Design a protein around this motif. Structure first.
Motif, PDB file in Angstrom:
ATOM      1  N   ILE A 294      25.260  39.150  27.608  1.00 31.37           N
ATOM      2  CA  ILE A 294      24.329  38.419  26.709  1.00 31.37           C
ATOM      3  C   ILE A 294      24.712  36.942  26.607  1.00 31.37           C
ATOM      4  CG2 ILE A 294      25.617  38.979  24.585  1.00 31.37           C
ATOM      5  CD1 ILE A 294      22.135  39.887  24.426  1.00 31.37           C
ATOM      6  N   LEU A 295      26.009  36.617  26.733  1.00 26.25           N
ATOM      7  CA  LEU A 295      26.507  35.237  26.672  1.00 26.25           C
ATOM      8  C   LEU A 295      27.101  34.765  28.010  1.00 26.25           C
ATOM      9  CD1 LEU A 295      27.823  35.016  23.003  1.00 26.25           C
ATOM     10  CD2 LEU A 295      26.012  33.679  24.027  1.00 26.25           C
ATOM     11  N   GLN A 296      26.881  35.502  29.099  1.00 27.25           N
ATOM     12  CA  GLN A 296      27.137  35.007  30.490  1.00 27.25           C
ATOM     13  C   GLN A 296      28.588  34.471  30.582  1.00 27.25           C
ATOM     14  OE1 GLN A 296      24.713  35.036  33.552  1.00 27.25           O
ATOM     15  NE2 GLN A 296      24.950  36.849  32.223  1.00 27.25           N
ATOM     16  N   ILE A 297      29.512  35.299  30.142  1.00 33.06           N
ATOM     17  CA  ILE A 297      30.954  34.953  30.148  1.00 33.06           C
ATOM     18  C   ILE A 297      31.489  35.091  31.555  1.00 33.06           C
ATOM     19  CG2 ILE A 297      33.129  35.812  29.265  1.00 33.06           C
ATOM     20  CD1 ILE A 297      31.676  36.196  26.592  1.00 33.06           C
ATOM     21  N   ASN A 298      32.253  34.076  31.986  1.00 33.87           N
ATOM     22  CA  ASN A 298      32.624  33.842  33.402  1.00 33.87           C
ATOM     23  C   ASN A 298      33.957  34.508  33.747  1.00 33.87           C
ATOM     24  OD1 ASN A 298      32.605  30.735  35.415  1.00 33.87           O
ATOM     25  ND2 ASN A 298      32.860  32.870  35.980  1.00 33.87           N
ATOM     26  N   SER A 299      34.013  35.184  34.901  1.00 35.79           N
ATOM     27  CA  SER A 299      35.203  35.901  35.415  1.00 35.79           C
ATOM     28  C   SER A 299      36.297  34.895  35.809  1.00 35.79           C
ATOM     29  CB  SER A 299      34.839  36.791  36.568  1.00 35.79           C
ATOM     30  OG  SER A 299      34.352  36.006  37.666  1.00 35.79           O
ATOM     31  N   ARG A 300      35.993  33.612  35.953  1.00 36.53           N
ATOM     32  CA  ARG A 300      36.982  32.573  36.393  1.00 36.53           C
ATOM     33  C   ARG A 300      38.132  32.541  35.386  1.00 36.53           C
ATOM     34  NH1 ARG A 300      40.716  29.954  37.036  1.00 36.53           N
ATOM     35  NH2 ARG A 300      40.887  27.961  38.140  1.00 36.53           N
ATOM     36  N   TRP A 301      37.848  32.723  34.091  1.00 36.55           N
ATOM     37  CA  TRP A 301      38.836  32.576  32.997  1.00 36.55           C
ATOM     38  C   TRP A 301      38.976  33.803  32.115  1.00 36.55           C
ATOM     39  CZ3 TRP A 301      42.234  29.031  33.473  1.00 36.55           C
ATOM     40  CH2 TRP A 301      41.915  27.830  34.103  1.00 36.55           C
ATOM     41  N   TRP A 302      37.875  34.494  31.824  1.00 36.48           N
ATOM     42  CA  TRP A 302      37.752  35.291  30.578  1.00 36.48           C
ATOM     43  C   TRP A 302      37.811  36.800  30.772  1.00 36.48           C
ATOM     44  CZ3 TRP A 302      38.971  32.046  27.125  1.00 36.48           C
ATOM     45  CH2 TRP A 302      38.581  30.715  27.267  1.00 36.48           C
ATOM     46  N   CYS A 303      37.429  37.342  31.915  1.00 35.49           N
ATOM     47  CA  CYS A 303      37.391  38.802  32.151  1.00 35.49           C
ATOM     48  C   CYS A 303      37.819  39.110  33.583  1.00 35.49           C
ATOM     49  CB  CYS A 303      36.034  39.419  31.821  1.00 35.49           C
ATOM     50  SG  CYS A 303      34.666  38.846  32.843  1.00 35.49           S
ATOM     51  N   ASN A 304      38.246  40.347  33.808  1.00 33.38           N
ATOM     52  CA  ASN A 304      38.646  40.777  35.155  1.00 33.38           C
ATOM     53  C   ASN A 304      37.525  41.566  35.817  1.00 33.38           C
ATOM     54  OD1 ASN A 304      40.185  43.392  36.736  1.00 33.38           O
ATOM     55  ND2 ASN A 304      40.342  41.285  37.438  1.00 33.38           N
ATOM     56  N   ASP A 305      37.085  41.081  36.952  1.00 35.42           N
ATOM     57  CA  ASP A 305      36.149  41.839  37.835  1.00 35.42           C
ATOM     58  C   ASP A 305      36.800  42.171  39.186  1.00 35.42           C
ATOM     59  OD1 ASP A 305      35.878  39.403  39.298  1.00 35.42           O
ATOM     60  OD2 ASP A 305      33.765  39.157  38.745  1.00 35.42           O
ATOM     61  N   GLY A 306      38.070  41.847  39.427  1.00 34.03           N
ATOM     62  CA  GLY A 306      38.743  42.214  40.684  1.00 34.03           C
ATOM     63  C   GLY A 306      38.277  41.441  41.882  1.00 34.03           C
ATOM     64  N   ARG A 307      37.317  40.528  41.775  1.00 38.29           N
ATOM     65  CA  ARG A 307      36.808  39.832  42.974  1.00 38.29           C
ATOM     66  C   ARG A 307      36.712  38.325  42.737  1.00 38.29           C
ATOM     67  NH1 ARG A 307      30.398  41.186  43.328  1.00 38.29           N
ATOM     68  NH2 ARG A 307      29.694  39.498  41.943  1.00 38.29           N
ATOM     69  N   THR A 308      37.496  37.784  41.820  1.00 39.16           N
ATOM     70  CA  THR A 308      37.511  36.339  41.567  1.00 39.16           C
ATOM     71  C   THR A 308      38.923  35.804  41.803  1.00 39.16           C
ATOM     72  OG1 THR A 308      35.800  36.718  39.912  1.00 39.16           O
ATOM     73  CG2 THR A 308      36.730  34.506  40.040  1.00 39.16           C
ATOM     74  N   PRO A 309      39.258  35.453  43.054  1.00 42.39           N
ATOM     75  CA  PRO A 309      40.591  34.938  43.369  1.00 42.39           C
ATOM     76  C   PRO A 309      41.064  33.817  42.466  1.00 42.39           C
ATOM     77  CG  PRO A 309      39.488  35.477  45.395  1.00 42.39           C
ATOM     78  CD  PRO A 309      38.471  35.650  44.278  1.00 42.39           C
ATOM     79  N   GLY A 310      42.281  33.998  41.976  1.00 38.82           N
ATOM     80  CA  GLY A 310      43.044  32.937  41.308  1.00 38.82           C
ATOM     81  C   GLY A 310      42.613  32.836  39.877  1.00 38.82           C
ATOM     82  N   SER A 311      41.753  33.758  39.415  1.00 37.98           N
ATOM     83  CA  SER A 311      41.155  33.728  38.064  1.00 37.98           C
ATOM     84  C   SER A 311      42.133  34.288  37.037  1.00 37.98           C
ATOM     85  CB  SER A 311      39.844  34.485  38.051  1.00 37.98           C
ATOM     86  OG  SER A 311      40.032  35.900  38.124  1.00 37.98           O
ATOM     87  N   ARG A 312      41.814  34.073  35.774  1.00 36.79           N
ATOM     88  CA  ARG A 312      42.491  34.684  34.643  1.00 36.79           C
ATOM     89  C   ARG A 312      41.558  35.682  33.962  1.00 36.79           C
ATOM     90  NH1 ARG A 312      46.561  31.266  32.950  1.00 36.79           N
ATOM     91  NH2 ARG A 312      47.309  33.032  31.721  1.00 36.79           N
ATOM     92  N   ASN A 313      42.130  36.394  33.013  1.00 42.67           N
ATOM     93  CA  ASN A 313      41.477  37.439  32.188  1.00 42.67           C
ATOM     94  C   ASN A 313      41.930  37.219  30.742  1.00 42.67           C
ATOM     95  OD1 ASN A 313      40.317  39.733  31.064  1.00 42.67           O
ATOM     96  ND2 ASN A 313      41.672  41.197  32.060  1.00 42.67           N
ATOM     97  N   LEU A 314      41.526  36.099  30.146  1.00 45.68           N
ATOM     98  CA  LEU A 314      42.081  35.672  28.842  1.00 45.68           C
ATOM     99  C   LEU A 314      41.528  36.524  27.704  1.00 45.68           C
ATOM    100  CD1 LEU A 314      42.095  31.822  29.427  1.00 45.68           C
ATOM    101  CD2 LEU A 314      44.046  33.424  29.532  1.00 45.68           C
ATOM    102  N   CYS A 315      40.397  37.216  27.894  1.00 44.89           N
ATOM    103  CA  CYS A 315      39.873  38.137  26.863  1.00 44.89           C
ATOM    104  C   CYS A 315      40.466  39.537  27.034  1.00 44.89           C
ATOM    105  CB  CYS A 315      38.347  38.153  26.858  1.00 44.89           C
ATOM    106  SG  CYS A 315      37.719  36.583  26.215  1.00 44.89           S
ATOM    107  N   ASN A 316      41.231  39.764  28.110  1.00 43.99           N
ATOM    108  CA  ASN A 316      41.945  41.049  28.346  1.00 43.99           C
ATOM    109  C   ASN A 316      40.939  42.211  28.370  1.00 43.99           C
ATOM    110  OD1 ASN A 316      44.724  39.813  28.215  1.00 43.99           O
ATOM    111  ND2 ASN A 316      44.050  39.368  26.135  1.00 43.99           N
ATOM    112  N   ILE A 317      39.886  42.064  29.167  1.00 42.56           N
ATOM    113  CA  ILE A 317      38.784  43.052  29.275  1.00 42.56           C
ATOM    114  C   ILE A 317      38.292  43.082  30.707  1.00 42.56           C
ATOM    115  CG2 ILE A 317      37.927  43.149  26.921  1.00 42.56           C
ATOM    116  CD1 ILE A 317      35.789  40.986  27.790  1.00 42.56           C
TER     117      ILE A 317
END
Ligand SMILES: [Cl-]
Ligand SMILES: [Cl-]
Ligand SMILES: [Cl-]
Ligand SMILES: [Cl-]
Ligand SMILES: [Cl-]
Ligand SMILES: [Cl-]
Ligand SMILES: [Cl-]
Ligand code: NA
Length: 129
Positions: free
Chosen positions: A55-78
């Protein structure tokens, strides 16, 4: 789930987003309208290979893990899939972390370009809140 305008305003208020970091509920509803058209299952791939979720288009670069965003973080731990739920709890909790990050709602480019400075109260006009 595709929310109605007042339905989403009420859900966002129930999860404590109204006036969070000083952003009135109409700012949050406007952001959701232009990011996802109120659709919890919205996904959009970015040119850099990251993906925006929910609903708020939160980006895998920083905030969530999708397993397919190299070098990204998962700062929301989801897992990014949690952001696509009919229950908006994970999106709201993660959005509270994003809007605390230093640039407020400017993190949402659609908010900056389409909502910032506008009569955002129109988005909650008529809603029983
Ligand atoms: Cl609408
Ligand atoms: Cl408002
Ligand atoms: Cl990843
Ligand atoms: Cl991380
Ligand atoms: Cl995960
Ligand atoms: Cl909900
Ligand atoms: Cl701010
Ligand atoms: Na990530």
């Amino acid at each position: 789930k595709v929310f109605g305008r007042c339905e989403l305003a009420a859900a966002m208020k129930r999860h404590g987003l109204d006036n969070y970091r000083g952003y009135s509920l109409g700012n949050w509803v406007c952001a959701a309208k232009f990011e996802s058209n109120f659709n919890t299952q919205a996904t959009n791939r970015n040119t850099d290979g990251s993906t925006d979720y929910g609903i708020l288009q939160i980006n895998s670069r920083w905030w969530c893990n999708d397993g397919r965003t190299p070098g990204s973080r998962n700062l929301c731990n989801i897992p990014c899939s949690a952001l696509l739920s009919s229950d908006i709890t994970a999106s709201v909790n993660c959005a509270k972390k994003i809007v605390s990050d230093g640039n407020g709602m400017n993190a949402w480019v659609a908010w900056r370009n389409r909502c910032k400075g506008t009569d955002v109260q129109a988005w909650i006009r008529g809603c029983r809140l």
